[PDB]
Subunit: 192 residues, 2 copies
């Protein structure tokens, strides 16, 4: 009847569910399974409410989940989903390697380009102002509605998604051996 | 890279999380930990969305969670929370023993009495009409605003909560050895 030991067991189990749901979210994002992504995101968000003290590893896990959530809502606070993804990306405790900078740059341009794709050019300019010769050339492209300019074709949505999926594959392999998924695959392999 | 085996592992893990969250919900309800109950309920509801095919045991688990959720919202569809708890209680695949009938009767009267406690006597009559010499005596009590009649004092909110908590203790012991909580308590005992 020890309430403290029970709360401790509940916190250990919340940590296991968090890693399992991050793994599931990464796979759904990689596979393009939108409805499964939406369901796993709702589950991860609820499970995270059962945690009040997080380790550095757990903080990185929750911010990766938040970041992918903004990326998945990219084509849909007073900022756009892709602007929110950029704020999380720039503050996650991670190495600022070549891949990090590539994703950062692709998000910055796509935060503008998704507004143009949606036909909201005033919003495209407001996004540009909040993020940013280069600047005056990018603002002229938005102003001229030059949505299919070679610059936008190189810093494309598909290229942003491909680079982010490559990062998702590293998270997926770094968490492939976490307790809950490993025990669950063991049960499935035993059946069989 | 087998998507089917991964989805199978995700379903096995959803089953484990469901039993763990039912256990956690039962403890919070027994302890009167309202905020913890609200958080565990949100988590259970989200996790249950990741399941599309349930066994008879899993159906009983989800309906116990739904039932306690209605009981916890009892003093707050075109029916009241306690009327919804009654519909679930009468349809759960379980034995209709003495305890089942006691809980059923206490809920039926409290579904009326919580409306009187809230000062909504028109709603108390509408609840009576939907659920129901005995009937004409119960309707006269509502009509006379006889909230503290000896009948209401014997079929009280506290007596309803005590009887439901006794049932919760049976669910709690029947699920005490489920995979996730057992593995989590093992980690906690190892630290100590
Ligand atoms: C701060 N908010 C409201 C969010 O970022 C919601 O998104 C989330 C949150 C946690 C996990 C997840 F998978 C998604
Ligand atoms: C001289 N300057 C500022 C440049 O040519 C950099 O261009 C870029 C390209 C992509 C993203 C970005 F945010 C900036
Ligand atoms: C049918 N609805 C919307 C509900 O009953 C919500 O309540 C729930 C649902 C599942 C688990 C739980 F713990 C609570
Ligand atoms: C002759 N009759 C109908 C009775 O005296 C039963 O009284 C009850 C008592 C509690 C709950 C309930 F629903 C009914």
């Amino acid at each position: 009847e020890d309430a403290g030991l029970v709360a401790e067991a509940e916190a250990v189990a919340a940590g296991w569910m968090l890693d399992f749901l991050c793994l599931s979210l990464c796979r759904a994002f990689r596979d393009g399974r939108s409805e499964d992504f939406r369901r796993t995101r709702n589950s991860a968000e609820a499970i995270i409410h059962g945690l009040s003290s997080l380790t550095a590893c757990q903080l990185r896990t929750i911010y990766i989940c938040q970041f992918l959530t903004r990326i998945a809502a990219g084509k849909t606070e007073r900022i756009t989903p892709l602007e929110s993804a950029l704020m999380i990306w720039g503050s996650i405790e991670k190495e600022h390697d070549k891949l990090h900078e590539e994703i950062q740059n692709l998000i910055k341009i796509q935060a503008i380009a998704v507004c143009m794709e949606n036909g909201n050019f005033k919003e495209a300019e407001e996004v540009f102002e909040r993020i940013f010769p280069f600047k005056s050339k990018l603002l002229m492209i938005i102003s001229q509605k030059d949505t299919f300019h070679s610059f936008f074709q190189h810093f494309s949505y598909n290229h942003m998604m491909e680079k982010i999926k490559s990062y998702v594959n590293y998270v997926l392999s770094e968490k492939s051996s976490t307790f809950l998924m490993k025990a669950a695959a063991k049960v499935v392999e035993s059946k069989r």
